[PDB]
Design a protein around this ligand. Structure first.
Ligand SMILES: *[C@@H]1O[C@H](CO)[C@@H](O[C@@H]2O[C@H](CO)[C@@H](O[C@@H]3O[C@H](CO)[C@@H](O)[C@H](O)[C@@H]3O)[C@H](O)[C@H]2NC(C)=O)[C@H](O)[C@H]1NC(C)=O
Ligand SMILES: *[C@@H]1O[C@H](CO)[C@@H](O[C@@H]2O[C@H](CO)[C@@H](O[C@@H]3O[C@H](CO)[C@@H](O)[C@H](O)[C@@H]3O)[C@H](O)[C@H]2NC(C)=O)[C@H](O)[C@H]1NC(C)=O
Ligand SMILES: *[C@@H]1O[C@H](CO)[C@@H](O[C@@H]2O[C@H](CO)[C@@H](O[C@@H]3O[C@H](CO)[C@@H](O)[C@H](O)[C@@H]3O)[C@H](O)[C@H]2NC(C)=O)[C@H](O)[C@H]1NC(C)=O
Ligand SMILES: *[C@@H]1O[C@H](CO)[C@@H](O[C@@H]2O[C@H](CO)[C@@H](O)[C@H](O)[C@H]2NC(C)=O)[C@H](O)[C@H]1NC(C)=O
Ligand SMILES: *[C@@H]1O[C@H](CO)[C@@H](O)[C@H](O)[C@H]1NC(C)=O
Ligand SMILES: *[C@@H]1O[C@H](CO)[C@@H](O)[C@H](O)[C@H]1NC(C)=O
Lengths: 127, 113, 252
């Protein structure tokens, strides 16, 4: 169906942004919406933002307004999210999230699928 | 705003017997479509979570059978007719409609006898 | 980017008689001189491009590369738009010319380049995130085209999926000839509701287009509109595609 791969184990120093990618195999990147979520060590997950399939926009959570930019490029099929101003203490695991629309061409209804298939995740390494 | 909390602090269980858990919120979850949308998650240690349910009255494919939940009301539940050792991990309940899309608080599940 | 959805076991292609069908006009002054035509009461090979059985899954795919032998007669009976266009050519390879009639929603684009086909043509559809409507971009069919020689555009050959009367069936017809280096096509749209069988009565097909492709033709294959079956939780599918294929002869 779909396979999602990501890598964020780049060892670097504090005081800059971080980039995270999500290679999507299977459904083309123009077919499946995306979301994002963060889970710090010893802490639960947290929904940050994702695509609105019925609004054609990506909306962040109030906590993350203006902190991070998330974009995608169907030529490379790598959903990008550059989180700004990270340091060593903030290193943690970050995951992708994907879904699409349910109905066929003469559809009968939209769908808010949320998220159902996840990537392997990756600790955003800063040190 | 919509929260999602589960009544139990931890859920230590024993092999072979059924189990249940509850999840509570601050508002309803029924959608403008009339149909309500609900989901449940399961996570194994060192692994990303898998979606076990994507509506109040369904379960995801690939996951083990007998995985069921209370598909009605606003205090939905996750139930299985059995339990195994490899299922050790944590659980969560998630909503769909409220676009702020907050993440609920999970409950530890353990094998005890 | 290609898929093998056309796998199946050998299927006996049925047959049926053709009652005075496919007769068309050779001149330009009379409507309502030896040339290729379909003899009365001939045999027409009936196909099932997409078929179901048992669990009633659309597993029985097929779109075999029929032989383009002294022209072709073509026809369909349905109330949909699954069948889009056709591929004509000698060897359907990336070494010799070939023809493509890629009908789409608002136009028919006849193209002749050095296409590099896959083992099967698709022309499917899917959904585009940024806008809110389905898209039919289908580079799947031909992968690439090194050197081209001709192009064209016009109003679509096929009528719309009119669906004006649900108690009726649309019987579209066609006739293809490559006589003397000129590609000739006729057509006729006919209302019918009685039976699936090709009906009695004359049709008197009429000309549509003539283009100087200047190509040799021996193999022709048909195209379908397989829509991405976005899994409710394989790959592509459609519903009940069928058609007829007779053959012409120099008889007269
Ligand atoms: C299109 O081709 C099919 C397949 O050949 C034709 O099937 C017809 O099959 C019938 C029997 O099912 C054949 O009848 C034969 O009659 C002889 C007596 O002459 C008898 O000894 C045989 O046992 C058999 O019953 C018939 O040959 C055959 N029809 C034709 C025309 O060949 C189908 O009819 C063909 N349709 C057309 C429009 O040609
Ligand atoms: C059906 O086939 C026609 C083929 O003619 C497709 O339309 C053609 O392709 C594009 C449509 O955008 C046009 O080329 C250029 O597009 C850019 C935008 O990407 C535009 O800025 C240029 O001015 C130029 O138009 C081309 O003109 C257009 N031609 C025609 C005759 O429509 C069409 O997209 C296909 N699909 C459908 C649903 O019609
Ligand atoms: C389709 O396009 C491909 C593009 O690579 C064509 O490849 C062709 O390869 C032949 C090999 O002889 C080329 O002929 C040679 O051209 C070079 C200059 O480009 C010349 O120095 C050699 O002496 C020889 O004449 C050919 O030019 C090259 N591209 C072209 C223009 O065709 C392939 O042949 C093309 N097939 C066609 C035209 O359908
Ligand atoms: C059109 O193309 C076909 C290719 O299928 C040509 O057929 C070949 O013809 C040559 C001689 O003309 C034979 O030696 C080959 O064995 C044939 N092979 C095949 C696969 O057909 C055909 O000759 C070309 N021209 C015409 C008028 O049909
Ligand atoms: C199946 O698809 C692959 C894709 O490359 C192709 O190589 C192969 O010929 C197709 N058919 C079979 C029977 O594998
Ligand atoms: C989306 O629709 C608008 C409508 O004006 C059109 O201008 C634009 O080209 C379309 N974009 C895509 C990617 O389909």
């Amino acid at each position: 169906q779909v396979r999602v791969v990501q890598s964020g184990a780049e060892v670097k120093n504090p005081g800059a942004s971080v980039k995270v990618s999500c290679k999507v195999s299977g459904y083309t990147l123009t077919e499946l919406s995306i979301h994002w979520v963060r889970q710090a060590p010893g802490n639960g997950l947290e929904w940050m933002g994702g695509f609105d399939p019925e609004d054609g926009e990506t909306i962040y959570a109030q906590k993350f307004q203006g902190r991070v930019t998330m974009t995608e490029d169907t030529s490379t099929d790598t959903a990008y999210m550059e989180l700004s101003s990270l340091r060593s203490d903030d290193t943690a695991v970050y995951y992708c999230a994907t879904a699409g629309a349910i109905t066929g061409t003469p559809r009968n209804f939209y769908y808010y699928y949320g998220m159902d298939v996840w990537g392997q995740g990756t600790t955003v390494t800063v040190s | 705003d919509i929260v999602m909390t589960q009544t139990p602090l931890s859920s230590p269980v024993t092999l072979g017997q059924p189990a249940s858990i509850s999840c509570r919120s601050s508002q309803s979850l029924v959608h403008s479509d009339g149909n309500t949308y609900l989901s449940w998650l399961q996570q194994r240690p060192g692994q990303p979570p898998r979606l076990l349910i994507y509506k109040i009255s369904n379960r995801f494919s690939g996951v083990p059978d007998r995985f069921s939940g209370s598909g009605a009301g606003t205090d939905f539940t996750l139930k299985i007719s059995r339990v195994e050792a490899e299922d050790v991990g944590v659980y969560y309940c998630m909503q769909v409609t409220q676009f702020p899309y907050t993440f609920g608080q999970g409950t530890k599940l353990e094998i005890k006898r | 980017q290609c898929v093998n959805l056309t796998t199946r076991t050998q299927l006996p292609p049925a047959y049926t008689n053709s009652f005075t069908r496919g007769v068309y006009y050779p001149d330009k002054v009379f409507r309502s001189t030896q040339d290729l035509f379909l003899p009365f009461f001939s045999n027409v090979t009936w196909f099932h491009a997409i078929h179901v059985s048992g669990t009633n899954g659309t597993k029985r795919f097929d779109n075999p590369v029929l032989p383009f032998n002294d022209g072709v007669y073509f026809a369909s009976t349905e109330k949909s738009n699954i069948i889009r266009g056709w591929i004509f050519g000698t060897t359907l390879d990336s070494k010799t010319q070939s023809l493509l009639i890629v009908n789409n929603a608002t136009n028919v684009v006849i193209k002749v380049c050095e296409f590099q086909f896959c083992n099967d043509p698709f022309l499917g559809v899917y959904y585009h995130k940024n806008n809110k409507s389905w898209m039919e971009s289908e580079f799947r069919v031909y992968s690439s085209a090194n050197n081209c020689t001709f192009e064209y555009v016009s109003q679509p050959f096929l009528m719309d999926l009119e669906g004006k009367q649900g108690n009726f069936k649309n019987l579209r017809e066609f006739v293809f000839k490559n006589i003397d280096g000129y590609f000739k096509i006729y057509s006729k749209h006919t209302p019918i509701n009685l039976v699936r069988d090709l009906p009695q009565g004359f049709s008197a097909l009429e000309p549509l287009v003539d283009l100087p492709i200047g190509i040799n033709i021996t193999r022709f294959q048909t195209l379908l509109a397989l829509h991405r079956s976005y899994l409710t939780p394989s790959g592509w599918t459609a519903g009940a595609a069928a058609y007829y294929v007779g053959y012409l002869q120099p008889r007269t």
